[PDB]
Design a protein around this nucleic acid. Structure first.
Lengths: 44, 274, 87
RNA sequence: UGAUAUUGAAAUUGCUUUCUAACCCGCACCACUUAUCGUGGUGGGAGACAGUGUCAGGCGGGCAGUUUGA
RNA sequence: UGAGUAGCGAAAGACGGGUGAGAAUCCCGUCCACCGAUUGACUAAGGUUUCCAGAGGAAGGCUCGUCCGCUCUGGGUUAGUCGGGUCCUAAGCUGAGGCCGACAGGCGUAGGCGAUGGAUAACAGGUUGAUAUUCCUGUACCACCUAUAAUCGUAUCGAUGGGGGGACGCAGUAGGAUAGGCGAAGCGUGCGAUUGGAUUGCACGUCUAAGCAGUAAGGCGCUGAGCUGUGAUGGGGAGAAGUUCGAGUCGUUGAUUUCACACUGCCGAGAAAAGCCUCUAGAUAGAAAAUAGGUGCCCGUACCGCAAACCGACACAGGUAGUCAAGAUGAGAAUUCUAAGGUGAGCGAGCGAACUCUCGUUAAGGAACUCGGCAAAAUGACCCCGUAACUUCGGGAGAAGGGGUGCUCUUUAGGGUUAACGCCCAGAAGAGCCGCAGUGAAUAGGCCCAAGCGACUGUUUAUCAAAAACACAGGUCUCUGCUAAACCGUAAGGUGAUGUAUAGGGGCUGACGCCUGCCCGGU
RNA sequence: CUACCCUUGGUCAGGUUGAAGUUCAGGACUGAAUGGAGGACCGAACCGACUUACGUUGAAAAGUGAGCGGAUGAACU
């Protein structure tokens, strides 16, 4: 059987990375919200 | 013409194919091609706007000139060739002073031809001249609309239009479809007819040979669910069940006109299609 | 210059080829040309060649507490004439 | 689909018809510029129409919110 | 509690000798067994120290454990040439000005980023517990700099520009060489104990890049070309013998590898840009012949990688791209047995109950069973003969239905290569021998007669429906004159289409053959 | 992951048949050579998932055994 998560460093950082988050208004809201909570690890 | 096939299997049974005794060459001139990436009816939003496209075979865009704008600098039709992205066959004309171009090869040409600005060339197949010079009764193809952009009308395979009477501002034209309409007197047009007349005679035979020209299958609205097509569901095979067959987006798809009511070119049409 | 940190001495692969080559843990942001220059400037020799290898940080986790070691450049210089002392 | 603003001139009688500067050109060339973007300039075409704004009428299960008694 | 209960995750282990406080399990050895188009060698993604050595046995390991992918303590990754960057560009993304948009923001030109592709200089051997075109040994090639340079000066340097070239589909053959394989000459080791024999039994039969030549074929005397031959190489490796000595031959066969997307054919008409070669705009003023010396940065490099290290909660019968792929048998990468090489499955010992699962045989009968011949039996390969109705002339069809096959020995044509002998592939026919059975095992179509549906190949409900459903090639109606209609977005902007009525969108029907009747109230 | 598309790559042991076309002998058409066509045939990898048994507090939140279908293409990747 083929499961849903096939890991890929490039895919993971190109979709959920930091720079992809910072290159948007909404991603910046997400980063601000995670800094507000106190997350040890902001982005993926 | 066209060549048939013995029915050595199912699938090539009632299948015919165009017989390329007209294509006199098997390679394009290198410098007149460009890449041509496919788009399965996807717009710049990435969405599927126009259906039943996608797939097929790679192409190379032969840069054809529909301008045909020179000083009567003569040409010699060297090669007739295949164009994978228009129904006509193309013709690789060389000008008298070193230039290569692709004409829509009309029917019956290996001679040598002249773009005709004024009363320069003659009315013989392959000459492109204004509509003010072309006498009445000629069958021209590759007619411009706006003076100097490249001809747009009468451009498919085996297509041609008649030059009916004129006025000095707008020569009439009877298009291939029965449309009779006026065209500005300084818009070029090529004498003759566009060759490759067998193009409508060919049975593509099998469902795969249709699928490698870029045509995905077309489902019928009547075998779709109610949220997809107005022809909707129903138990068993159901009829249209409406007072009018509708298109997939909810417009009456049979008999209703979509021709705009305020266009600038309604003083240019004398009669409509019939 | 002081772009050399710590003379690596190990069981075999810092002594069993030590008569001719010397290994130094070096600063983690330096070419192997700066290392050549630094060794020629400190030990006063003439260097034939130099190799460099980065290591990962390995997670020595002792006492209910996680954590990584440091990363490090391991340079290995091959002398042409002369020798290095202190060991 | 109408009235109206952008919206001008002339004839003839508000319906009509002609013109050019408004407006428009997924027209041609030129310059920014060793860019099918754009801007500007020059011709052409169209021309007070189209497009756009406010107002009104009609069509409109394409879509929506709902009712469908005991 | 259920209860000392179900389970303990596919598979062959045995004994000896150890270590030990303690051994079915840990180590070493011998035998045996399993894979072997793979359970073997190598690599991309992924993981991220699981790699190695010394020590340990609390917890983990489905039992045990003295062991370990677990714990503790020290170690391990080496590049001018390998993969990526300092080179190029598809798709896509981003986008100075710009266009649009309540705001946010969207689209987009020049530009830039972006390999899965294009270009690009290094090979063979040796070594440790852990690296290996990286370290070392030998022999190289490429870019740049410094001192000479032979010979200089329209000599040279050229574009951020013009041109060429790069540069490309698919299929089918025939061919050239070579990798590999196989058999006999030199080799070296043995020459037995069970009857026998020494024309005996084994295992070996090598070697690169680069540079000098020449070279099947290929396209237009030029360009490019696998392979060969000389050195490279007194070297390195080498079955073995006593640090040193040690052979390296023929004949055959031959790819799916390379010449080579070559050549022919075909139609569905098959990337781009750079490096590269040139051209003059423009620079105007060195040496590329040669002599040596110097210079060459960043990133990955450990280990797993059909898996106990990845994705599946697990030391999980599942999933995971490409790469090399030996012998006997054969069409063959099928089948059976082995090679190189690697594993024996992380609970066992008894006894051989009912019952359940997997498997084998069975008297007479032969579908009588049953929703139904479901399941299982049977056919099954190669050669020869023979083969109906019907038909769209293609087919049906491997129709159906029969017969043959093992070994030995005689005699005769044969194919290839070949001085010749010699090998390899092949047969004929006939005389014999054996058996219950001769493609003696494994692998390998059940067939026919009718009927309903759908013409056909295809597609479909990931996980209760694979069909008569969908698609279809063909038919027909209808809208669309090009800023086309239709569609997405509020708009800019796009697709349609770099297309243009032999074209484009939409509705119905569904190959082919014969046809497709009537009514316009209403809507 | 799954559906569809786009751009650049890769894989499909072996065998069977024998269309057009051409070449020859005749006399438009015949026969023999050649040719190698096909959503052709058989059949491994590969990709599926028809039947059926087993499993169902499973080895596995969809699998295993035996058979079964496509296997040059509307292929798989």
């Amino acid at each position: 059987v083929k499961r849903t998560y096939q890991p890929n460093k490039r895919k993971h950082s190109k979709v959920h990375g930091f720079r992809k988050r910072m290159s948007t208004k909404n991603g910046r809201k997400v980063l601000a919200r995670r800094r507000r909570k106190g997350r040890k690890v902001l982005s993926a | 013409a066209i060549k048939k096939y013995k029915p050595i299997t199912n699938g090539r049974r009632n299948m015919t194919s165009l017989d390329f005794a007209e294509i006199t060459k098997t390679t394009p001139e290198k410098s007149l091609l460009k890449p041509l990436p496919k788009k399965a009816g996807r717009n710049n939003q990435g969405k599927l706007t126009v259906r039943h496209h996608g797939g097929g075979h790679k192409r190379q865009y032969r840069v054809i000139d529909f301008k045909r704008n020179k000083d009567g600098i003569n040409a010699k039709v060297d090669s007739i060739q295949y164009d994978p992205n228009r129904s006509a066959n193309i013709a690789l004309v060389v000008y008298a002073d070193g230039e290569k171009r692709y004409i829509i090869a009309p029917k019956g040409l290996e001679v040598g031809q002249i773009v005709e600005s004024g009363a320069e060339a003659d009315i013989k197949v392959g000459n492109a001249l204004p509509l003010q010079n072309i006498p009445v009764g000629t069958v021209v193809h590759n007619i411009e609309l706006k003076p100097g952009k490249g001809g747009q009308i009468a451009r498919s395979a085996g297509a041609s239009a008649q030059v009916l009477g004129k006025e000095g501002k707008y020569v009439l034209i009877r298009l291939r479809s029965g449309e009779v309409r006026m065209i500005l007197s300084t818009c070029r047009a090529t004498i003759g007819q566009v060759g490759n007349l067998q193009h409508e005679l060919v049975n593509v035979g099998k469902a795969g040979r249709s699928r490698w020209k870029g045509i995905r299958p077309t489902v019928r609205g009547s075998v779709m669910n109610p949220n997809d097509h107005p022809h909707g569901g129903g138990e068993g095979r159901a009829p249209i069940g409406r007072p009018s067959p509708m298109s997939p987006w909810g417009k009456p798809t049979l008999g209703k006109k979509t021709r705009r009511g305020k266009k600038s070119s309604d003083k240019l049409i004398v009669r409509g299609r019939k | 210059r002081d772009i050399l940190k710590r003379p690596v001495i190990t069981e075999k692969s810092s002594e069993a080829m030590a008569e001719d080559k010397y290994t130094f843990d070096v600063d983690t942001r330096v070419n192997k040309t700066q290392v050549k220059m630094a060794v020629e400037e400190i030990f006063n020799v003439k260097v034939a060649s130099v190799n460099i290898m980065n290591y990962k940080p390995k997670k020595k986790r002792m006492g209910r507490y996680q954590g990584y070691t440091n990363k490090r450049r391991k340079a290995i210089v091959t002398l042409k004439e002369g020798s290095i002392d202190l060991f």
